[PDB]
């Protein structure tokens, strides 16, 4: 019943003498009544109805479709069109008002009719729908998150599925604490339930630990910061525990920003750590072109001339260079910027392409054979709306096997590659802003095996008490 797609027919007898709208007998997909509609307007109507008879206002299903009119003389001569649409009561029906010229669907000389009967065919491609109890933990084995903290959910999951971090986090000494203050703890919950629950997991108490309340302290930052609040937070806690320095060992990299005055002999090198990488896009085509630009060399002149002390203002070069690329690579694409002419905080939906395999040791001044620097796509945080608000999802293939899933809040579905990748490449309206890549040699480690027997014990217990009390 809850199939992911299908095809169904509906034939209208006594057509020419038609006066009103005819609803077909329901076909089910994703557990929803998808019906066909035919009504004149002279032209021939053709739409697809979707669970229009349900009262509810809290439900939604997206879907592709092929409204097809069969040719009783040859199938390849049939006339059909394509439609994509978001369905929900207020707009439970989509299609075409001028689906075909009535004078052509009635010309007995070209098939479409026989006994003045016309046969309509509709191939629907349904996604998982919200507001209709979707047992994520069933046809995905993965559970979801509620609400939408905006981008926090995506980040949360993206993190949960960074296994090595997960175990390490579990193993924290979170006893002497206060269940509403302790972030590490407040995260140990999410992670735990995120694993054992069958019902949406409640961000609720985590959202408090940072202070990020009321939700404008969510729009007042971005993934990067949250990632850095949660993360950095968890380590000053892993600071004396057998799982010490786990985070940097997973996400940290050593960068180098330099300067070497052109005419005079003076250089200034500064290695800095880094837990992510902000890549530019506006004007670039793919990731490989972003790195190229990132490691381009900026000249200092005019007002930009370099402050050189005993040398005074001088002419120099300035640029950055990588020394090491983390095991886990957080790449944030800058699509969110401040327009010049407006006062607007605008989003750039231009087209940017990321690949499944990333070649990257050719951007370090010194590479190490035996241990290349090649990452593989692991997560794609998407966002929709040319507006700075909207909706946050996140695609992943948790065990890095190439098998994907969409974590749209409490609706985790199985999906194709071209849906997480080739589908989030901008658009000249819905796309990706962040990415997670894991190095090819450290995959198996970063994505270790999870067992109910990794979580402390006394922890499963504390998490238990609090869940008996009131």
Short mmCIF file of C-alpha atoms in Angstrom, two decimals:
data_model
loop_
_atom_site.label_atom_id
_atom_site.label_comp_id
_atom_site.label_asym_id
_atom_site.label_seq_id
_atom_site.Cartn_x
_atom_site.Cartn_y
_atom_site.Cartn_z
CA UNK A 1 0.00 0.00 0.00
CA UNK A 2 2.73 2.46 1.01
CA UNK A 3 4.52 1.94 -2.33
CA UNK A 4 6.96 4.57 -3.60
CA UNK A 5 5.28 4.86 -6.99
CA UNK A 6 2.86 3.32 -9.46
CA UNK A 7 0.69 3.70 -12.57
CA UNK A 8 -3.12 3.58 -12.81
CA UNK A 9 -5.88 3.99 -15.41
CA UNK A 10 -9.24 5.74 -15.57
CA UNK A 11 -11.42 5.61 -18.68
CA UNK A 12 -14.20 8.07 -19.46
CA UNK A 13 -17.06 6.53 -21.41
CA UNK A 14 -19.40 8.75 -23.43
CA UNK A 15 -16.83 11.55 -23.72
CA UNK A 16 -17.89 13.96 -26.49
CA UNK A 17 -21.17 14.40 -24.62
CA UNK A 18 -19.37 15.51 -21.48
CA UNK A 19 -20.49 18.45 -19.36
CA UNK A 20 -18.79 18.18 -15.95
CA UNK A 21 -15.81 16.95 -13.88
CA UNK A 22 -15.21 13.24 -13.30
CA UNK A 23 -13.17 11.90 -10.36
CA UNK A 24 -11.55 8.51 -10.88
CA UNK A 25 -11.53 5.61 -8.42
CA UNK A 26 -8.57 6.09 -6.02
CA UNK A 27 -5.17 4.44 -6.49
CA UNK A 28 -2.91 4.31 -3.44
CA UNK A 29 0.69 5.46 -3.05
CA UNK A 30 2.54 6.16 0.20
CA UNK A 31 -0.82 5.38 1.77
CA UNK A 32 -2.61 8.23 0.02
CA UNK A 33 -5.63 8.33 -2.35
CA UNK A 34 -4.22 9.58 -5.66
CA UNK A 35 -7.11 10.21 -8.10
CA UNK A 36 -7.40 11.38 -11.72
CA UNK A 37 -9.50 14.34 -12.87
CA UNK A 38 -11.03 15.14 -16.26
CA UNK A 39 -13.19 18.19 -17.00
CA UNK A 40 -13.74 20.39 -20.06
CA UNK A 41 -13.20 24.17 -20.01
CA UNK A 42 -13.03 24.22 -25.90
CA UNK A 43 -10.30 22.13 -24.21
CA UNK A 44 -9.67 18.92 -22.21
CA UNK A 45 -8.84 19.11 -18.52
CA UNK A 46 -6.45 16.74 -16.81
CA UNK A 47 -5.19 16.91 -13.24
CA UNK A 48 -4.01 14.64 -10.44
CA UNK A 49 -5.84 14.82 -7.13
CA UNK A 50 -4.20 13.81 -3.88
CA UNK A 51 -5.94 12.87 -0.64
CA UNK A 52 -8.29 15.77 -1.31
CA UNK A 53 -11.11 14.19 0.68
CA UNK A 54 -9.16 14.15 3.97
CA UNK A 55 -10.10 16.98 6.31
CA UNK A 56 -6.66 17.42 7.94
CA UNK A 57 -4.54 20.51 7.23
CA UNK A 58 -1.30 19.08 8.61
CA UNK A 59 -0.07 16.73 5.90
CA UNK A 60 2.01 17.01 2.76
CA UNK A 61 3.30 14.84 0.01
CA UNK A 62 5.57 15.76 -2.88
CA UNK A 63 5.58 13.88 -6.18
CA UNK A 64 6.54 13.59 -9.86
CA UNK A 65 4.02 12.45 -12.47
CA UNK A 66 3.18 11.57 -16.06
CA UNK A 67 -0.39 12.43 -17.03
CA UNK A 68 -0.88 10.20 -20.07
CA UNK A 69 -3.71 9.88 -22.58
CA UNK A 70 -3.57 6.52 -24.33
CA UNK A 71 -3.71 6.15 -28.12
CA UNK A 72 -5.86 3.19 -29.18
CA UNK A 73 -3.69 2.98 -32.31
CA UNK A 74 -0.21 2.98 -30.79
CA UNK A 75 1.22 3.64 -27.32
CA UNK A 76 4.19 5.69 -28.56
CA UNK A 77 1.75 8.13 -30.17
CA UNK A 78 -0.01 8.83 -26.87
CA UNK A 79 0.22 12.41 -25.63
CA UNK A 80 1.49 12.92 -22.08
CA UNK A 81 3.11 15.67 -20.00
CA UNK A 82 5.22 15.93 -16.83
CA UNK A 83 4.35 17.47 -13.46
CA UNK A 84 6.07 18.08 -10.14
CA UNK A 85 4.17 19.55 -7.25
CA UNK A 86 3.81 19.82 -3.50
CA UNK A 87 0.41 18.59 -2.42
CA UNK A 88 -1.60 19.60 0.62
CA UNK A 89 -5.28 20.47 1.05
CA UNK A 90 -5.08 24.13 0.05
CA UNK A 91 -3.51 22.78 -3.21
CA UNK A 92 -4.53 19.09 -3.31
CA UNK A 93 -4.88 19.13 -7.07
CA UNK A 94 -2.47 19.95 -9.89
CA UNK A 95 -2.33 19.42 -13.63
CA UNK A 96 -3.43 21.15 -16.80
CA UNK A 97 -6.43 23.27 -17.72
CA UNK A 98 -5.51 23.18 -21.37
CA UNK A 99 -4.15 19.61 -21.34
CA UNK A 100 -5.01 19.13 -24.99
CA UNK A 101 -7.08 20.67 -27.79
CA UNK A 102 -10.57 19.13 -27.48
CA UNK A 103 -10.80 19.23 -31.28
CA UNK A 104 -7.81 16.84 -31.44
CA UNK A 105 -8.81 14.39 -28.71
CA UNK A 106 -12.11 13.91 -30.56
CA UNK A 107 -10.79 13.54 -34.11
CA UNK A 108 -11.55 9.80 -34.51
CA UNK A 109 -8.88 9.83 -37.22
CA UNK A 110 -6.05 9.81 -34.67
CA UNK A 111 -6.91 7.13 -32.11
CA UNK A 112 -7.52 8.72 -28.68
CA UNK A 113 -11.18 7.67 -28.78
CA UNK A 114 -13.21 4.51 -29.39
CA UNK A 115 -16.87 4.31 -28.39
CA UNK A 116 -16.15 7.99 -27.62
CA UNK A 117 -14.23 6.59 -24.67
CA UNK A 118 -10.93 8.15 -23.62
CA UNK A 119 -8.39 6.45 -21.35
CA UNK A 120 -6.25 8.46 -18.95
CA UNK A 121 -3.07 7.08 -17.40
CA UNK A 122 -1.09 8.58 -14.53
CA UNK A 123 2.33 7.42 -13.35
CA UNK A 124 2.98 9.00 -9.96
CA UNK A 125 6.38 9.25 -8.21
CA UNK A 126 5.64 9.86 -4.53
CA UNK A 127 8.05 10.90 -1.81
CA UNK A 128 7.50 10.30 1.87
CA UNK A 129 4.79 12.51 3.23
CA UNK A 130 4.47 14.46 6.45
CA UNK A 131 1.44 14.40 8.68
CA UNK A 132 0.57 10.73 8.21
CA UNK A 133 2.67 8.79 10.72
CA UNK A 134 5.74 7.78 8.76
CA UNK A 135 7.55 5.04 10.69
CA UNK A 136 10.96 6.31 9.67
CA UNK A 137 12.52 3.58 11.75
CA UNK A 138 11.21 0.87 9.45
CA UNK A 139 11.85 1.43 5.78
CA UNK A 140 15.05 3.22 6.70
CA UNK A 141 15.97 1.77 10.06
CA UNK A 142 16.77 5.40 10.88
CA UNK A 143 14.71 7.72 13.13
CA UNK A 144 13.87 11.40 12.80
CA UNK A 145 13.82 14.78 14.55
CA UNK A 146 10.74 16.95 15.13
CA UNK A 147 9.92 20.68 14.77
CA UNK A 148 12.11 22.99 12.62
CA UNK A 149 16.29 25.53 15.48
CA UNK A 150 16.34 25.84 11.67
CA UNK A 151 19.50 24.07 10.46
CA UNK A 152 20.21 22.50 13.86
CA UNK A 153 18.45 19.21 13.07
CA UNK A 154 20.46 18.50 9.91
CA UNK A 155 23.63 19.32 11.83
CA UNK A 156 22.53 17.07 14.73
CA UNK A 157 21.98 14.02 12.54
CA UNK A 158 25.02 14.77 10.39
CA UNK A 159 26.83 14.56 13.66
CA UNK A 160 25.09 11.49 15.07
CA UNK A 161 26.19 9.59 11.99
CA UNK A 162 29.82 10.53 12.58
CA UNK A 163 30.07 7.29 14.50
CA UNK A 164 33.54 7.58 15.98
CA UNK A 165 32.39 10.83 17.52
CA UNK A 166 29.19 9.16 18.69
CA UNK A 167 30.89 6.39 20.70
CA UNK A 168 33.38 8.87 22.08
CA UNK A 169 30.57 11.15 23.14
CA UNK A 170 28.70 8.27 24.76
CA UNK A 171 31.74 7.44 26.89
CA UNK A 172 31.80 10.87 28.57
CA UNK A 173 31.82 11.13 32.42
CA UNK A 174 28.55 13.02 32.57
CA UNK A 175 27.41 12.10 36.07
CA UNK A 176 28.21 14.99 38.39
CA UNK A 177 25.91 17.33 36.47
CA UNK A 178 22.62 19.20 36.04
CA UNK A 179 20.29 17.80 33.38
CA UNK A 180 19.37 21.25 32.04
CA UNK A 181 22.84 22.83 32.02
CA UNK A 182 25.22 20.09 30.79
CA UNK A 183 25.43 20.26 27.01
CA UNK A 184 27.43 17.06 26.67
CA UNK A 185 24.64 15.34 28.59
CA UNK A 186 21.88 17.21 26.75
CA UNK A 187 23.50 15.70 23.66
CA UNK A 188 23.97 12.27 25.08
CA UNK A 189 20.19 12.17 25.19
CA UNK A 190 19.59 13.14 21.60
CA UNK A 191 22.23 10.71 20.43
CA UNK A 192 20.77 7.91 22.59
CA UNK A 193 17.15 8.34 21.57
CA UNK A 194 18.40 9.04 18.04
CA UNK A 195 19.45 5.43 18.13
CA UNK A 196 16.73 3.61 20.06
CA UNK A 197 13.58 5.65 19.39
CA UNK A 198 10.81 4.79 16.94
CA UNK A 199 9.21 8.22 17.40
CA UNK A 200 10.72 11.65 16.57
CA UNK A 201 13.54 12.73 18.87
CA UNK A 202 13.09 15.88 20.94
CA UNK A 203 15.67 18.61 20.39
CA UNK A 204 13.87 20.50 23.16
CA UNK A 205 16.38 20.37 26.06
CA UNK A 206 19.45 20.55 23.82
CA UNK A 207 18.17 23.80 22.30
CA UNK A 208 18.34 25.20 25.81
CA UNK A 209 21.88 24.26 26.84
CA UNK A 210 23.37 26.78 24.36
CA UNK A 211 20.91 29.40 25.50
CA UNK A 212 19.73 29.48 21.93
CA UNK A 213 16.17 30.08 22.93
CA UNK A 214 13.22 31.69 21.22
CA UNK A 215 14.71 30.75 17.83
CA UNK A 216 16.29 34.03 16.77
CA UNK A 217 19.54 32.87 18.26
CA UNK A 218 19.32 30.23 15.54
CA UNK A 219 18.92 32.72 12.73
CA UNK A 220 21.68 34.77 14.37
CA UNK A 221 24.34 32.14 13.61
CA UNK A 222 24.96 29.37 11.10
CA UNK A 223 25.85 25.65 11.15
CA UNK A 224 29.55 26.46 11.72
CA UNK A 225 29.00 28.15 15.08
CA UNK A 226 26.53 25.64 16.44
CA UNK A 227 28.88 22.86 15.36
CA UNK A 228 31.51 24.75 17.30
CA UNK A 229 29.40 25.31 20.36
CA UNK A 230 28.35 21.71 20.68
CA UNK A 231 31.67 20.24 19.62
CA UNK A 232 34.13 22.42 21.50
CA UNK A 233 31.72 22.02 24.39
CA UNK A 234 32.00 18.25 24.42
CA UNK A 235 35.76 18.27 24.54
CA UNK A 236 36.46 20.41 27.57
CA UNK A 237 34.52 17.48 28.99
CA UNK A 238 36.53 14.79 27.24
CA UNK A 239 39.53 16.68 28.62
CA UNK A 240 40.71 13.95 31.00
CA UNK A 241 38.76 11.01 29.70
CA UNK A 242 40.16 8.04 27.79
CA UNK A 243 38.54 9.62 24.73
CA UNK A 244 40.58 12.81 24.97
CA UNK A 245 41.19 15.01 21.96
CA UNK A 246 38.81 12.94 19.91
CA UNK A 247 37.22 15.90 18.17
CA UNK A 248 40.32 17.60 16.81
CA UNK A 249 41.66 14.21 15.81
CA UNK A 250 38.49 13.99 13.73
CA UNK A 251 37.93 17.49 12.46
CA UNK A 252 41.07 19.60 13.01
CA UNK A 253 43.50 20.77 10.32
CA UNK A 254 46.64 22.89 10.23
CA UNK A 255 46.52 25.91 7.95
CA UNK A 256 49.11 28.51 6.96
CA UNK A 257 48.63 32.17 6.18
CA UNK A 258 51.75 33.96 4.91
CA UNK A 259 53.37 37.18 3.68
CA UNK A 260 56.78 37.68 1.90
CA UNK A 261 57.31 41.34 0.95
CA UNK A 262 58.18 41.63 -2.75
CA UNK A 263 61.07 44.15 -2.78
CA UNK A 264 62.28 43.71 0.81
CA UNK A 265 63.31 40.46 2.58
CA UNK A 266 60.70 39.76 5.30
CA UNK A 267 58.19 36.96 5.71
CA UNK A 268 55.44 36.17 8.18
CA UNK A 269 54.08 32.60 8.44
CA UNK A 270 51.22 31.68 10.78
CA UNK A 271 49.88 28.16 11.13
CA UNK A 272 46.34 28.06 12.44
CA UNK A 273 44.05 25.14 13.31
CA UNK A 274 40.76 24.80 11.42
CA UNK A 275 37.66 22.73 11.92
CA UNK A 276 35.95 23.47 8.62
CA UNK A 277 36.59 25.26 5.35
CA UNK A 278 34.53 28.08 3.96
CA UNK A 279 34.55 27.84 0.17
CA UNK A 280 33.55 30.57 -2.23
CA UNK A 281 31.19 29.84 -5.08
CA UNK A 282 29.75 32.91 -6.72
CA UNK A 283 31.52 32.78 -10.06
CA UNK A 284 33.05 29.33 -9.67
CA UNK A 285 31.67 26.07 -11.15
CA UNK A 286 32.61 23.21 -8.85
CA UNK A 287 34.56 22.54 -5.67
CA UNK A 288 37.84 22.02 -7.43
CA UNK A 289 37.59 25.59 -8.65
CA UNK A 290 36.87 26.89 -5.19
CA UNK A 291 40.00 25.44 -3.76
CA UNK A 292 42.01 26.85 -6.66
CA UNK A 293 40.71 30.32 -5.83
CA UNK A 294 41.16 29.69 -2.06
CA UNK A 295 44.87 29.13 -2.64
CA UNK A 296 45.25 32.06 -5.01
CA UNK A 297 47.78 34.74 -4.09
CA UNK A 298 46.62 38.18 -2.95
CA UNK A 299 48.97 41.14 -3.60
CA UNK A 300 49.14 43.96 -1.09
CA UNK A 301 49.11 47.61 -2.42
CA UNK A 302 47.40 51.04 -2.30
CA UNK A 303 45.91 50.92 1.19
CA UNK A 304 46.30 47.16 1.30
CA UNK A 305 50.08 47.52 1.51
CA UNK A 306 51.57 45.53 4.39
CA UNK A 307 52.44 46.97 7.85
CA UNK A 308 56.14 45.85 8.22
CA UNK A 309 57.48 47.61 11.30
CA UNK A 310 61.08 48.73 10.83
CA UNK A 311 60.42 48.28 7.12
CA UNK A 312 57.23 50.31 7.28
CA UNK A 313 54.39 49.99 4.80
CA UNK A 314 55.60 47.60 2.11
CA UNK A 315 54.63 45.64 -0.98
CA UNK A 316 54.11 41.94 -0.36
CA UNK A 317 52.23 38.76 -1.15
CA UNK A 318 49.66 37.14 1.14
CA UNK A 319 47.94 33.80 0.83
CA UNK A 320 47.03 30.61 2.66
CA UNK A 321 48.15 26.99 2.20
CA UNK A 322 47.04 23.66 3.67
CA UNK A 323 49.34 21.45 5.68
CA UNK A 324 46.81 18.81 6.65
CA UNK A 325 43.18 18.00 5.75
CA UNK A 326 41.07 16.45 8.53
CA UNK A 327 39.63 12.91 8.62
CA UNK A 328 36.16 14.52 8.60
CA UNK A 329 35.86 17.51 6.27
CA UNK A 330 33.18 20.14 6.95
CA UNK A 331 32.91 22.30 3.83
CA UNK A 332 30.65 25.27 4.02
CA UNK A 333 29.57 26.86 0.77
CA UNK A 334 28.90 30.59 0.96
CA UNK A 335 25.50 31.13 -0.60
CA UNK A 336 24.41 33.40 2.17
CA UNK A 337 25.59 36.98 1.68
CA UNK A 338 24.67 40.66 2.10
CA UNK A 339 23.48 42.30 -1.12
CA UNK A 340 25.01 45.71 -1.87
CA UNK A 341 21.95 47.53 -3.14
CA UNK A 342 19.14 46.76 -0.66
CA UNK A 343 20.02 46.09 3.04
CA UNK A 344 19.19 42.49 2.31
CA UNK A 345 20.78 39.35 3.68
CA UNK A 346 20.57 37.47 0.38
CA UNK A 347 21.09 33.86 -0.71
CA UNK A 348 22.95 32.88 -3.89
CA UNK A 349 21.24 29.93 -5.55
CA UNK A 350 23.70 29.81 -8.43
CA UNK A 351 24.89 26.35 -9.54
CA UNK A 352 27.75 24.71 -7.62
CA UNK A 353 28.88 21.08 -8.13
CA UNK A 354 30.43 18.79 -5.55
CA UNK A 355 31.51 15.21 -6.36
CA UNK A 356 31.33 11.82 -4.71
CA UNK A 357 35.08 11.44 -4.70
CA UNK A 358 37.18 14.49 -3.91
CA UNK A 359 40.88 14.67 -4.92
CA UNK A 360 42.59 17.10 -2.55
CA UNK A 361 46.23 16.42 -1.73
CA UNK A 362 47.16 18.59 -4.65
CA UNK A 363 46.31 21.60 -2.38
CA UNK A 364 48.75 20.80 0.44
CA UNK A 365 52.32 22.01 -0.04
CA UNK A 366 53.52 18.54 1.13
CA UNK A 367 51.53 15.34 0.52
CA UNK A 368 51.99 11.91 2.02
CA UNK A 369 51.74 8.91 -0.30
CA UNK A 370 50.47 5.75 1.37
CA UNK A 371 47.90 8.10 2.95
CA UNK A 372 46.52 10.27 0.17
CA UNK A 373 44.09 13.05 0.76
CA UNK A 374 40.99 11.81 -0.98
CA UNK A 375 37.58 12.28 0.65
CA UNK A 376 34.14 10.95 -0.22
CA UNK A 377 30.73 12.63 0.12
CA UNK A 378 28.96 11.74 3.36
CA UNK A 379 26.36 14.41 3.96
CA UNK A 380 24.68 17.21 2.07
CA UNK A 381 22.83 19.80 4.09
CA UNK A 382 20.25 21.39 1.83
CA UNK A 383 18.08 24.53 2.24
CA UNK A 384 15.19 25.93 0.18
CA UNK A 385 14.00 29.41 -0.77
CA UNK A 386 15.84 32.39 -2.36
CA UNK A 387 14.77 33.82 1.00
CA UNK A 388 16.92 33.58 4.18
CA UNK A 389 14.30 31.38 5.80
CA UNK A 390 12.51 28.26 4.69
CA UNK A 391 13.30 24.60 5.27
CA UNK A 392 16.31 22.47 6.27
CA UNK A 393 16.97 18.88 5.19
CA UNK A 394 20.08 16.69 5.05
CA UNK A 395 20.97 13.76 2.87
CA UNK A 396 23.30 11.11 4.06
CA UNK A 397 24.62 7.64 3.42
CA UNK A 398 25.59 6.91 7.09
CA UNK A 399 27.79 3.87 6.52
CA UNK A 400 29.42 5.55 3.54
CA UNK A 401 28.40 2.67 1.29
CA UNK A 402 26.85 4.94 -1.30
CA UNK A 403 23.36 4.07 -0.10
CA UNK A 404 21.45 7.25 0.69
CA UNK A 405 18.69 8.63 2.86
CA UNK A 406 16.84 11.95 3.31
CA UNK A 407 16.39 13.29 6.88
CA UNK A 408 13.54 15.76 6.45
CA UNK A 409 12.79 16.28 10.15
CA UNK A 410 10.79 13.25 11.31
CA UNK A 411 10.66 11.80 7.82
CA UNK A 412 13.79 9.76 7.00
CA UNK A 413 13.36 8.13 3.61
CA UNK A 414 15.45 6.07 1.27
CA UNK A 415 16.26 8.01 -1.92
CA UNK A 416 18.46 7.82 -5.00
CA UNK A 417 21.89 9.35 -5.48
CA UNK A 418 20.75 11.83 -8.11
CA UNK A 419 18.45 13.10 -5.36
CA UNK A 420 21.14 13.98 -2.82
CA UNK A 421 23.74 14.92 -5.34
CA UNK A 422 23.00 15.96 -8.92
CA UNK A 423 19.82 17.42 -7.43
CA UNK A 424 21.37 19.95 -5.05
CA UNK A 425 23.58 21.63 -7.64
CA UNK A 426 22.08 25.10 -7.29
CA UNK A 427 19.70 26.22 -10.03
CA UNK A 428 19.44 29.33 -12.25
CA UNK A 429 15.79 27.58 -5.93
CA UNK A 430 16.55 24.66 -3.55
CA UNK A 431 20.11 23.58 -2.72
CA UNK A 432 23.15 22.62 -0.62
CA UNK A 433 25.16 24.94 1.56
CA UNK A 434 27.33 22.55 3.62
CA UNK A 435 29.07 19.25 2.95
CA UNK A 436 30.80 16.49 4.94
CA UNK A 437 33.56 14.44 3.40
CA UNK A 438 35.55 11.65 4.99
CA UNK A 439 39.06 10.65 3.91
CA UNK A 440 39.15 7.39 1.91
CA UNK A 441 41.73 5.80 4.19
CA UNK A 442 40.00 6.62 7.44
CA UNK A 443 36.49 5.66 6.38
CA UNK A 444 36.11 2.39 8.25
CA UNK A 445 37.37 4.10 11.42
CA UNK A 446 35.27 7.23 11.28
CA UNK A 447 32.24 5.06 10.59
CA UNK A 448 32.92 2.34 13.21
CA UNK A 449 30.27 -0.14 14.30
CA UNK A 450 27.67 0.93 16.87
CA UNK A 451 26.37 -1.43 19.59
CA UNK A 452 23.91 -1.08 22.43
CA UNK A 453 26.91 -2.21 24.50
CA UNK A 454 29.01 0.91 23.97
CA UNK A 455 26.78 3.27 25.93
CA UNK A 456 28.24 3.30 29.49
CA UNK A 457 25.57 1.53 31.49
CA UNK A 458 25.27 3.83 34.41
CA UNK A 459 24.33 6.25 31.59
CA UNK A 460 21.56 4.18 30.08
CA UNK A 461 20.47 4.22 33.74
CA UNK A 462 20.64 7.96 34.42
CA UNK A 463 18.85 8.54 31.13
CA UNK A 464 16.42 6.01 32.58
CA UNK A 465 15.73 7.60 35.98
CA UNK A 466 15.06 11.02 34.50
CA UNK A 467 12.64 9.10 32.36
CA UNK A 468 10.45 7.78 35.19
CA UNK A 469 10.32 11.02 37.09
CA UNK A 470 7.16 13.04 36.23
#
